[PDB]
Paper text:
activation loop conformational energetics in FGFR1. function of FGFR1, as has been postulated for other kinases. crossed in the transition between DFG-in and DFG-out states. kinase suggests a high free-energy barrier for the DFG flip.
pathway models for the binding of PDA and ponatinib to FGFR1. were determined to be enthalpy driven and entropy driven, respectively. interaction between the t-butyl group of PDA and the P-loop. in the PDA-bound ensemble, while Phe642 was significantly protected. with either ligand-free or PDA-bound states. ponatinib complex compared with the unbound or PDA-bound kinase.
Author numbering: 464 to 486, 489 to 644, 651 to 765
Write the structure that this text describes.
């Protein structure tokens, strides 16, 4: 059984379980009644993490460890925050903030410019549009979340648009910050090794500097509007591209300044990469000078 932490405990009758969000344990959408003591009468839409039917002892241990890690890291606007937990007299439920617009990759792709007669999906026409200032603002918010996590001594190890969630208010929130098959693909069929720093991939050295490399790939994802890094590149060819010092091309509609930022994040020497603190400062300055007119 689990011990009661009254800092986070929410009674079971206060959580109304809803539709599944996905399946790593399962996550469902829910409504929490009286999450805050003012008001005990207000419902808040939340995401709830719980274990699947065939859950092992280590699966439960990992869920507990992730919840424990979130309590220790504390609160920030640009991370998925812990809101509560149902630990007593039933299955463990970990309650976190809800991001109604899904992950950053989905959010960017759904807001791509309309489809033309040469496009894969010519019928694509979103009722939602992103200016150049909006894309730099996304990168600023993610850098801010990462700067906070780094100040808390947290190394993400899988920073990518898939692990950034977007709220109803377009706030970027870093996800899965408190959690190794190189050939294993994601839910969307992409290879996570494509976000890894060379020293993380070849020497298994994970630092804030290796997360900055990943953030460089995340920036390329923002400016390609959810583009796929190295499409058609298998793991062994990726390794060779990295050993050769190859770097991804400059996306179109991306300033020389922002491509230089990407390239700086991808410095071969980890110590020479900008820190998250420098990236937040450079991004804050760039946001203010970036046109929202297109
Ligand atoms: C239905 C609308 N749709 C829009 C396209 C989808 C909206 C999806 N929103 C949404 N919000 C908040 C969520 C929070 C966590 C979440 C993040 C955490 O980080 C710290 C920790 C956590 O537990 C401890 C849960 C989460 N983790 C998942 O593993 N999820 C799947 C299985 C879908 C990949 N998934 C969320 N998903």
């Amino acid at each position: 059984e689990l011990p009661e932490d009254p800092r986070w405990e929410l009674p079971r009758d206060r959580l109304v379980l809803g539709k599944p969000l996905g399946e790593f344990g399962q996550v469902v959408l829910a409504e929490a009644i009286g999450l805050d003591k003012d008001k005990p009468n207000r419902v808040t839409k939340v995401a709830v993490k719980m274990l699947k039917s065939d859950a092992t002892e280590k699966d439960l241990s990992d869920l507990i460890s992730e919840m424990e890690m979130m309590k220790m890291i504390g609160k920030h606007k640009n991370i998925i925050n812990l809101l509560g937990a149902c630990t007593q007299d039933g299955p463990l439920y970990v309650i976190v903030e809800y991001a109604s617009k899904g992950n950053l990759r989905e959010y960017l792709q759904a807001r791509r410019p309309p489809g033309l007669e040469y496009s894969y999906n010519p019928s694509h026409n979103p009722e939602e549009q992103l200016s150049s200032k909006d894309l730099v603002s996304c990168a600023y918010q993610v850098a801010r979340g990462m700067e906070y996590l780094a100040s808390k001594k947290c190394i993400h190890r899988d920073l990518a648009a898939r692990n950034v969630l977007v709220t109803e208010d377009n706030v970027m929130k870093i996800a899965d910050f408190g959690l190794i098959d190189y050939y294993k693909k994601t839910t969307n069929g992409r290879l996570p090794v494509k976000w890894m720093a060379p020293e993380a991939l070849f020497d298994r050295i994970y630092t804030h500097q290796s997360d900055v490399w990943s953030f460089g790939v995340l920036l390329w994802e923002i400016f390609t509007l959810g583009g796929s890094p190295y499409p058609g590149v298998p793991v062994e060819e990726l390794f060779k591209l990295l050993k050769e010092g190859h770097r991804m091309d400059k996306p179109s509609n991306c300033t020389n300044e922002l491509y230089m930022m990407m390239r700086d994040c991808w410095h071969a020497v980890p110590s020479q990469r900008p820190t998250f603190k420098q990236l937040v400062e450079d991004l804050d300055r760039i946001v203010a000078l970036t046109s929202n007119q297109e």
